[PDB]
Design a protein around this ligand. Structure first.
Ligand SMILES: Nc1ncnc2c1ncn2[C@@H]1O[C@H](COP(=O)(O)OP(=O)(O)O)[C@@H](O)[C@H]1O
Ligand SMILES: Nc1ncnc2c1ncn2[C@@H]1O[C@H](COP(=O)(O)OP(=O)(O)O)[C@@H](O)[C@H]1O
Ligand SMILES: Nc1ncnc2c1ncn2[C@@H]1O[C@H](COP(=O)(O)OP(=O)(O)O)[C@@H](O)[C@H]1O
Ligand code: BEF
Ligand code: BEF
Ligand code: BEF
Ligand SMILES: [K+]
Ligand SMILES: [K+]
Ligand SMILES: [K+]
Ligand SMILES: [Mg+2]
Ligand SMILES: [Mg+2]
Ligand SMILES: [Mg+2]
Lengths: 524, 524, 524
């Protein structure tokens, strides 16, 4: 593959022109008065989005060098979304700022490797100062606040997350799905519930709605699919002699085994229900042990020294009540030690830290929430499918933000935190004169986010930056109300993590990026 | 791959140009004096249609940006059809008006997101105002009127649909099909009728055309296929001893059981006929118990404590008569008390509301109707294929509209409803001056539909709009007579559902669309 | 993909230019002095044809808009052929005349949708005037005349068709095949005849050419091949005492069974012949019960309760005489008389009508004719193959025409019919002025066909039209002799069906076509 090489200011400029494109395209979505971008998709109708990394991911340039530039800054936006879920635009805006003033500094002839050392040092300091400005976010008031801001001033969304986090606890999981009507809807499930139906419609008890109810039943668990015919008599015969109902959770139940269970329950011999296991293998098998230890039963596996025909009443689990409908199965207050239950959650703590990243965290906490806490699901409503993609995207941002705000705390929004930490670091110096510039470049660049928000309002950024920098603490500019005031009192909150993350990531890549003396790529 | 990005008014102009194409092609079909669009098809001859959403779907533009714009408003036309089934054109016109006046406001430098907030609130208000103006549609005259209007002034369509709804009621199902002769025809099937043929042609009785008539028959139902063993004998011997012709409803009957069945009917000991069960596997089993309880029979299931070999003369139901032909099977009378049937009809009511939308509702309402009410079918009498395609489309259009008008009520036609609610919302204000403009852009755009129906007459739209705004109530312009009057007395009717829908949908995408500061797409 | 849209007079013209091409290529074949069009075929040599729809189907234009136009009018020509089989050209000229004057009326700004209503009212009115002017076609003189006219003044074709219709009855089928000798040949078969040969040639009786004559034979029907078990013979032992000649029609006859049949016939105990059944199962089996009841025999089926060895002498049918050859087998008179036969004829009546249309009715009427009436075949002949294809098309045209002329009656040819009803509709008016013009446009267009015929003679159409419009009754212009006179007495007759159809179909597409305000297609 024949390559093409460029040097010096020639190459830097080509790179910069590319970066500016990715950045200038992301910038328009910043802040409450920030605007929307349309991304063309071959697949279906276009996508309208205010989410920065969403726009960033789609940017690709024809000039190989400009492309390289943009493709490099596209990473700072992406790394933010995989970490925080908010601040992608903020992080991207910071990244651009560092590089512009940075590359300008190289044109001054200053040594770049020294410039990076200065920046990284200034950045390290700024993070510490942020750890200082960080105040804990606890009350559902603050939760609604960080949520409302990250949602672009949707108070319903903010209020919705605070309720969800409040009802199911901090361990409760929350998911975002497409809506039916035009209204947002909050669903809450307490206790253990998974999605599967009764295998035969004939299992319905007295209650209508297709509800099957079992009071103080026996639960049975199989690692394998049942099928055959009758199978398992000793366990069923023991439950019949016992005087209680049985619940069966297996890989599946084939028609022969189902029929014989149906005939016995129809005639009235023994009250019985049988339901399919939660998921495909290892999803299912893992969630039996979650389910097994909750109800104090023992999982019967073909992979160990036990089998279905040999079973004891002790292998069975017990619960107060169980409810099964066409799509759902529920276990009301099953009986297992709090010791054993907390044992399974503690084992998932080791499961919390993984290499799987996203979707690993969604399905892992899902098991945990079901075992201890409860689940919350938010249904986003819309008139049309394109508004749905916008509403749900604003909801996902707000969800990650509130979660992040909860754990790592909050600082004043409006990017005023960065502009404040920059004011605190003013007396900072480096090893050499060149390193000093790298430090100063960073502080000037921490102004960028605030100065960008104002510009999106079409107002003089120069004036607002001045009038905010003249003051101290949480005094800041409200872009929505277009008036100054206390950021914290006005409910404008940045999860500290998203602000910290945006700053760190942009500096890392931009620091490396201004060190470029050459660029190699494939020929057109 | 490599993309192309444009910003601001540069991009908006490109977007609008596209929108206008999609719209301008659709606009021409609006109103009674509106005209037809031709859509070329590679397979066969081209199609001539006045139906708006049909035209919108076919629009695709060469300029990548212009295309993106059009593809977005193409959605408002499509969502309209998916909701109401009428008002695709009107909704398209509204969007353009919103986008046109909307983008104009952004060019002024007003904040788009405030424009959107200003619009949706005005829209929300209009929805309430329309929902208030909606009046019940009951009398068959009114039904005939809205049907005729959606049919573009075809009285036969109005009078024909009104009769069908009048004969089988609100709940009767109506379907629309292609036809042989030139006159519209309405066929109605009473009692229980499902579509399947006799497996053996020798079952034919006196009546030609393959007619098989059976007096006081028996109904038998198999969850399973009855091909191989043909062991029902003991049940048959009981019925042969009774000397009655029965009806056999199974998954299917193979020639082995049939051949001996043929010979049995040939010899004369007992006349017997057998036809296939109505539906697909899970679907049919739901419709099997429905047929059994109608005739008072009991369903034979392999999933229950019964079996194919075990049945009694008592498990079969009785009917007055049954008629089986090449295509359809019929039971003219079943034997049962009104308590159990109306209960099962009441029980199917809960199955009626589901997620399954289309194809679910047709046969379900079909089943409910077959069990209690009746089914109605309308055959469209167009002469040729190019004339048939437009004719049938107007008939389906009118059907959804009558359906829509009945359930949610009707409002004054001629698009006069929107202009009327616009006058009622006149004092509506927003949070700031920009939001105020958003509201006015909405109200200003609500005149669009009427002035467009006028403009298609080649008459001054401004004058008619003014003189209509001069009046109140149902006062409006009649485009067919080209003179004014009362819209309701003149039988010009807008289903409240479609007008409300058309408004909401246009508002959704148009509101979102004017928020565009950038557009990203592929390179030519 | 990317589309292209044009509006208004811009698009209409493109549509028009297209229509004009399709028409102008068809026009030249109109009338006795009409000329021929050559259609190129890639595979073989070109085809020369006077058949109108033949030329129309081949037309495809490069400009997508013009193409759309022609492809739409290509349909009026196609529907004429699909209905009558004649009148295809006449219909096309009608369509062109209507469309041209219509667009002229639209360019005046008159409402198109009102124009369509005007025309159709005019068209519907004209049909009744035709139905009044329709006089019955009965005598073989008149039938020969309309056949001759549709044949382009070929008297042989008319008299030959007239001979066919008189001899074999109304139920007879008529076919057109390629010729051996330069001469046209009419072959007629009375009674029951099907095509299959004797499997063994040794069966020949007195008459040579392998002709077998069997007196009072016996009919047998088999769903099975007589291969495996040929020991079915005992029925023959009953036949050996009774008579020589029995005929067996089965799925097939194997060599071992044939061999034993040959030798037994060789000695002289009983002279016997055996032949295979004529057709495919579904069709042959349908024609099997036909032969059994014709001769008063009973069908033996393996799919029913009968067998190979089990037969009764009553199960066989009898005939006056039977003759069998290498190709065909024949039954002269049957013994089931009219009682069994017409019962089968009346039950097959419902099968005569269907949705299968062509291909099904071809051979179904074949079956019906064989049972009561007889089948007729016309051998069309020519010197060369290209002259044969034009010849066969005119024979098919004349064939379709006589069939159509018989059922719906005839009116004066030369298009004098249309121009005569046009004089009658002069006082017809619509609801508004635009509708009036549409009515006049139709009447103006009904003159087109006649003036076009004259134009093909290279004479002034205006002169003949006027001097023709001056007279009454059947007075018209004779294009062959170039002199005036009585159309019916001069033997120039139009089947009422073809003239009725041409107008209706031409009006259907032309009416819809002048409503076009827009056209969408793919980019070049
Ligand atoms: N009403 C407001 N007034 C002032 N600043 C705001 C307001 N709402 C949000 N902001 C600021 O704008 C930023 C919003 O970021 P956003 O564009 O939603 O995503 P990202 O954090 O990825 O840029 C936050 O840093 C916040 O401080
Ligand atoms: N004769 C008329 N005069 C004035 N307005 C009419 C008339 N007929 C219908 N309308 C209005 O216009 C609408 C019909 O639009 P139409 O042109 O049929 O588009 P579509 O076929 O997509 O519904 C109706 O909903 C009604 O409100
Ligand atoms: N000698 C004639 N004089 C006047 N009209 C004739 C004569 N021969 C045929 N015609 C007319 O020509 C028409 C048949 O023309 P042709 O092109 O063969 O069929 P079509 O136009 O229906 O495809 C008939 O309508 C008939 O009235
Ligand atoms: F651009 Be974001 F809401 F991180
Ligand atoms: F917008 Be419409 F009259 F279906
Ligand atoms: F179309 Be024809 F040969 F009358
Ligand atoms: K954003
Ligand atoms: K329309
Ligand atoms: K012709
Ligand atoms: Mg955000
Ligand atoms: Mg309509
Ligand atoms: Mg002809």
């Amino acid at each position: 593959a024949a390559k093409d090489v460029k040097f010096g200011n020639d190459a830097r400029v080509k790179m910069l022109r590319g970066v500016n494109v990715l950045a200038d395209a992301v910038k328009v979505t910043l802040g409450p008065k920030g605007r929307n971008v349309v991304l063309d998709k071959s697949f279906g109708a276009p996508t309208i989005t205010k989410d920065g990394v969403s726009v960033a991911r789609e940017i690709e340039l024809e000039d190989k060098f400009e492309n390289m530039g943009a493709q490099m800054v596209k990473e700072v936006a992406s790394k933010a979304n995989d970490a925080a879920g908010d601040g992608t635009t903020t992080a991207t805006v910071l990244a651009q700022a560092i590089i512009t003033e940075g590359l300008k500094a190289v044109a001054a002839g200053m040594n770049p490797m020294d410039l990076k050392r200065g920046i990284d040092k200034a950045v390290t300091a700024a993070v510490e100062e942020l750890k200082a400005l960080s105040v804990p976010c606890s009350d559902s008031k603050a939760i609604a606040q960080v949520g409302t801001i990250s949602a672009n001033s949707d108070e319903t969304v903010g209020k919705l997350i605070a309720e969800a986090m409040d009802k199911v606890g901090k361990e409760g999981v929350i998911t975002v799905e497409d809506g039916t009507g035009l209204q947002d809807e909050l669903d809450v499930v307490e206790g253990m519930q998974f999605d599967r139906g009764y295998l035969s419609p004939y299992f319905i008890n007295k209650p209508e709605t297709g509800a099957v109810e079992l009071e103080s039943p026996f639960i049975l668990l199989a690692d394998k699919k049942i099928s055959n015919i009758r199978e398992m008599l000793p366990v069923l015969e023991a439950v019949a002699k016992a005087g209680k109902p049985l619940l069966i959770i297996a890989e599946d139940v084939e028609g022969e085994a189902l029929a014989t269970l149906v005939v016995n329950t129809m005639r009235g011999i023994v009250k019985v229900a049988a339901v399919k296991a939660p998921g495909f293998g290892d999803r299912r098998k893992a969630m039996l042990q979650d389910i097994a230890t909750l109800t104090g039963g023992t999982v019967i596996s073909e992979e160990i020294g036990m089998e279905l025909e040999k079973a004891t009443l002790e292998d069975l689990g017990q619960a107060k009540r169980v409810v099964i409908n066409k799509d759902t199965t529920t276990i009301i207050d099953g009986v297992g030690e709090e010791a054993a239950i907390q044992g399974r959650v503690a084992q998932i703590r080791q499961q919390i830290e993984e290499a799987t990243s996203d979707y690993d965290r969604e399905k892992l906490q899902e098991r945990v929430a079901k075992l201890a806490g409860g689940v919350a699901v938010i249904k986003v409503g819309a008139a049309t499918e394109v508004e749905m993609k916008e509403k749900k995207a604003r909801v996902e941002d707000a969800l990650h933000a509130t979660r992040a705000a909860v754990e790592e705390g909050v600082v004043a929004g409006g990017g005023v935190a960065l502009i404040r930490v920059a004011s605190k670091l003013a007396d900072l110096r480096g090893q050499n004169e060149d390193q000093n510039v790298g430090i100063k470049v960073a502080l000037r660049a921490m102004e960028a986010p605030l100065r960008q928000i104002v510009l999106n309002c079409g107002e003089e950024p120069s004036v607002v930056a001045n009038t905010v920098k003249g003051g101290d603490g949480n005094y800041g500019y409200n872009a929505a109300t277009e008036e100054y005031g206390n950021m914290i009192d006005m409910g404008i909150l940045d999860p500290t993590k998203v602000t910290r993350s945006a700053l760190q990531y942009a500096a890392s890549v931009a620091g490396l990026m201004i060190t470029t003396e050459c660029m190699v790529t494939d020929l057109p």
